[PDB]
Amino acid sequence: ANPLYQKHIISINDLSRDDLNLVLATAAKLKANPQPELLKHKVIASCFFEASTRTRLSFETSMHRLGASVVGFSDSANTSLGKKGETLADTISVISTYVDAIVMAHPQEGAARLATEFSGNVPVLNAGDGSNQHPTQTLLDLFTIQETQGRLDNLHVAMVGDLKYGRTVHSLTQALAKFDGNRFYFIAPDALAMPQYILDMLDEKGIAWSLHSSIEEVMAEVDILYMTRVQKERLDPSEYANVKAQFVLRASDLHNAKANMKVLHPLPRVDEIATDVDKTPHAWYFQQAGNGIFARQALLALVLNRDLV
């Protein structure tokens, strides 16, 4: 009855549409009736090998909102882990003898799937592995889309900025591609284009996507405008001309936006969303960030508790 019990959460690709809807339904229930003791007597490792203050504080808050305890580190440079040449595999194996679940973010794509080979029984939750996947960002993104659009089907969704290195949009496009009738607009520098493996997937599913050279040319029809930061720390040095944001959203761009349209951003932002956007009714990134608590609580509850909420 709880298909996420004790499941590793590494990639959206591994989750089903029903899985996504179950997390979202559980998040709305907990948002409505908190369960502050549900994970009492659990200890969870917050292992941010790659620092990400917003995501870690979101995850750790969600742990505490369910009554779990927390141990961990905020950056692998603040640790002695690996300093003698030992493997990440061994680090995970040892930590897995301590805790009831491992939340990990790591600079290398695939590191979270590697961890699942060595964690024995303990679930690994991928809080972001380099430029690859970010499945819990997608879960809070979907909860937010569901909340503001009333549905996850038949949406016009624009994704802007660094689509190549953006783990956020890899996971979110895969998830939305599990629903029906969605239409994608990709607005990105040529060098930071959405990768081919995402495009082939949409093709094989018969899902329409197209490339666009401006936000304005798609503004009138988008329901969700998903903005991203250039992943400066992941760019190849030959991609240095792409560090500066090529597409900037300003309040004036919203003059012909649909009444229901919301602008999302996984955050942090550089200048791709000007601060005059913050005051409009379309700005929804901080609401989105707040919904991460409910999405991440839901996931933690479903993974760590045998039965449903």
Contact between 174 and Cl ion (CB under 5 A)? no
Percentages helix, strand, coil for the chain (3-state, rounded to 5) are: 40, 15, 45
Contact between 13 and its own copies (CB under 8 A)? no
* Beta carbon of residue 168, minimum distance to Cl ion (angstroms, whole number): 14
Among its own copies, Ca ion, Cl ion, none, the one that 253 touches (CB under a kind-dependent 5 to 8 A) is Ca ion
* Beta carbon of residue 126, minimum distance to its own copies (angstroms, whole number): 17
Helix (H) and strand (E) counts in the chain: 9, 9
Contact between 181 and its own copies (CB under 8 A)? no
Please classify residue 237 by burial: count the beta carbons closer than 10 Å to its beta carbon, then call 0-12 exposed, 13-18 middle and 19+ buried: exposed
* Beta carbon of residue 67, minimum distance to its own copies (angstroms, whole number): 9
Contact with its own copies (CB under 8 A): which of 72, 123, 161, 166? 72
| Rounded Cα distance, 283 and 257, in Å | 12
Contact between 229 and its own copies (CB under 8 A)? yes
Between residues 22 and 114, which has the closer beta carbon with respect to its own copies?
A: 114
Instruction: State the pairing for strand pair 43-48/69-73.
Output: parallel
CB 89 within 8 A of CB 62: no
Amino acid identity, position 37: E
| Rounded Cα distance, 122 and 7, in Å | 9
Contact between 11 and Cl ion (CB under 5 A)? yes
Bridge partners of residue 125, in order along the sequence: 9, 103
Contact with its own copies (CB under 8 A): which of 87, 154, 214, 256? 87
Tokens at residue 123, please? 């679930």
Q: State the Cα angle at 96 between 93 and 101, rounded to 5°.
A: 140
Contact between 93 and its own copies (CB under 8 A)? yes
Query: Which alpha helices (DSSP H) does the chain contain, by range?
Result: 17-32, 53-65, 88-96, 111-118, 135-149, 167-176, 196-204, 216-219, 285-304
* Beta carbon of residue 73, minimum distance to its own copies (angstroms, whole number): 6
Contact between 201 and its own copies (CB under 8 A)? no
Contact between 131 and Cl ion (CB under 5 A)? no
Residues 249-268 as x/- pattern, contact with Ca ion by CB under 5 A? ----x---------------
- Beta carbons within 8 Å of 275's beta carbon, 6+ residues apart: none
Contact with its own copies (CB under 8 A): which of 83, 255, 279, 306? 83
* Residues of the shown chain interacting with Cl ion in the complex, contacts defined by CB under 5 A: 11
* Residues of the shown chain interacting with its own copies in the complex, contacts defined by CB under 8 A: 34, 36, 40-41, 43, 45, 50-54, 57-58, 60-61, 64-65, 69-75, 77-81, 83-87, 90-91, 93-95, 97-99, 130, 229, 267-270, 275, 286-287, 289-290, 292-293
